[PDB]
Amino acid sequence: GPSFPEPKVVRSQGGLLSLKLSATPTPLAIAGQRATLLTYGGSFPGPTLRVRPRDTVRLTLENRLPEPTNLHWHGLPISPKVDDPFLEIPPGESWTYEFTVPKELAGTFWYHPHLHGRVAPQLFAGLLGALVVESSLDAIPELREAEEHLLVLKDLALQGGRPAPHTPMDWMNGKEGDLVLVNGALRPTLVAQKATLRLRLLNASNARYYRLALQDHPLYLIAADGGFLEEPLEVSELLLAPGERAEVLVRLRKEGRFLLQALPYDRGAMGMMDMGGMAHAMPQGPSRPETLLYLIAPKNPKPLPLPKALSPFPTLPAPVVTRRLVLTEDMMAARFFINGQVFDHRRVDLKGQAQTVEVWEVENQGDMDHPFHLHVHPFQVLSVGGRPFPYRAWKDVVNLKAGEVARLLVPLREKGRTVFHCHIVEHEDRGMMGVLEVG
Ligand SMILES: [Cu+2]
Ligand SMILES: [Cu+2]
Ligand SMILES: [Cu+2]
Numbered sequence: 001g002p003s004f005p006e007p008k009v010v011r012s013q014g015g016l017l018s019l020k021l022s023a024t025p026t027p028l029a030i031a032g033q034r035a036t037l038l039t040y041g042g043s044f045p046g047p048t049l050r051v052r053p054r055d056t057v058r059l060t061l062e063n064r065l066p067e068p069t070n071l072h073w074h075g076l077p078i079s080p081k082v083d084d085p086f087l088e089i090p091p092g093e094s095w096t097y098e099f100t101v102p103k104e105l106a107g108t109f110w111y112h113p114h115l116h117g118r119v120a121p122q123l124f125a126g127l128l129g130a131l132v133v134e135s136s137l138d139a140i141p142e143l144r145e146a147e148e149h150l151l152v153l154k155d156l157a158l159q160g161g162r163p164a165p166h167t168p169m170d171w172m173n174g175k176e177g178d179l180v181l182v183n184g185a186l187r188p189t190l191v192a193q194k195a196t197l198r199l200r201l202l203n204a205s206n207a208r209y210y211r212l213a214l215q216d217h218p219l220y221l222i223a224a225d226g227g228f229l230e231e232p233l234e235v236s237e238l239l240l241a242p243g244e245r246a247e248v249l250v251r252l253r254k255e256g257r258f259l260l261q262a263l264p265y266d267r268g269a270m271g272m273m274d275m276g277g278m279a280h281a282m283p284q285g286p287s288r289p290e291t292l293l294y295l296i297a298p299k300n301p302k303p304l305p306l307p308k309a310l311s312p313f314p315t316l317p318a319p320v321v322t323r324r325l326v327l328t329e330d331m332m333a334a335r336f337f338i339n340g341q342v343f344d345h346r347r348v349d350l351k352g353q354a355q356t357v358e359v360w361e362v363e364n365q366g367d368m369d370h371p372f373h374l375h376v377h378p379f380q381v382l383s384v385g386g387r388p389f390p391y392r393a394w395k396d397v398v399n400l401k402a403g404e405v406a407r408l409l410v411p412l413r414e415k416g417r418t419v420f421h422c423h424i425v426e427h428e429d430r431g432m433m434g435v436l437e438v439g
Helices: 119-125 168-173 425-429
Strands: 009-011 016-030 033-040 048-051 056-063 072-074 094-100 107-112 129-133 147-156 179-182 189-191 196-203 210-214 219-224 227-235 238-240 245-251 257-263 270-273 280-283 290-296 321-330 335-338 350-352 357-364 370-374 380-384 397-400 405-411 416-422 433-438
Touching (some): 033 119, 048 056, 107 219, 129 147, 168 270, 196 238, 416 425
Parallel strands (some): 016 056, 350 433
Antiparallel strands (some): 016 033, 072 107, 107 129, 210 238
């Protein structure tokens, strides 16, 4: 096959993507060894669904797992009656998700389980896939003539030919694995045929962070989680927290081999130590550096000019309310809280009005990084940690380092009951989630 592995693509046909997927334990070969994972569509990652605005998506999920499951259409501004975080599909049963892709939408999204208390083991075991909303902006020459690839960043650990079980420390920290994979492959080689690459990036890991840097090159950020930026933004590195997406242009500068690496990053994971005075918690410190892929440039590379503009970001109406959501931790109990409470599916925590804009101040009073995710209602990050955000784009996950406050502009879209939660999914399962009702 092609030197660079990527998930198989299923495209809408005539305005309709109608597809039956099964969530099933699947024997397969991965990173050179046989293992049984939990997959959608018999593959890890699951198939990439490629659609365009106004398409109808009709996805029937058949649950062939021994436990109940559901889907979260991560990042899609669709009704929470469809993207239903409280629905349960029992083993052996099926459910059809049907929605229309919104007209003003573009980017890389993804799908994965969201059954409270079971997310971390199901996601860790392999249940995820990407969804791409293609845009008319893809036709501008500076993008159309680039070589496009999806990079699904997701780690794994195997024990006895199956995903490794969660330990108590895994529930506290979020589980990371030793196999640090791209598109389910171990350190693949991308032999570029064009000098400009357009890379769609997805962090589909439970908890691992990717401090991305390409040797000898900057990256040009062109999209965040849920839409394009207004113009390309040059960065020397790009941190992708769990659940986040980005799109970058790479302008290969000379012939050669260049490593794409996940550089050392300390997200605050904790270990234990006994030095003669009772066991005490001690920081794990930064992650070890990882090579994600080998990028081979073509001969005599002459990259395309960058696009001068992408998509204007909407001018939002003045907000009508400010909310303050404080994140805290009880590490030794592996319990995690929002405004001092754990999730209760019967309890509505916030009540807002559709078509108004809110300011959300999310404050991390813990010591770990927490990537905060809101379903249904994409937001504009105004500032994090006292620093203004350097671009305007739609996001749906925002990473908070210890002590940091993020200020978000949240337009409320579809009416109904939805959730917000930490996207270290172990923390969600262990309580760090709340309920928003929009009326
Ligand atoms: Cu998600
Ligand atoms: Cu968290
Ligand atoms: Cu969620």
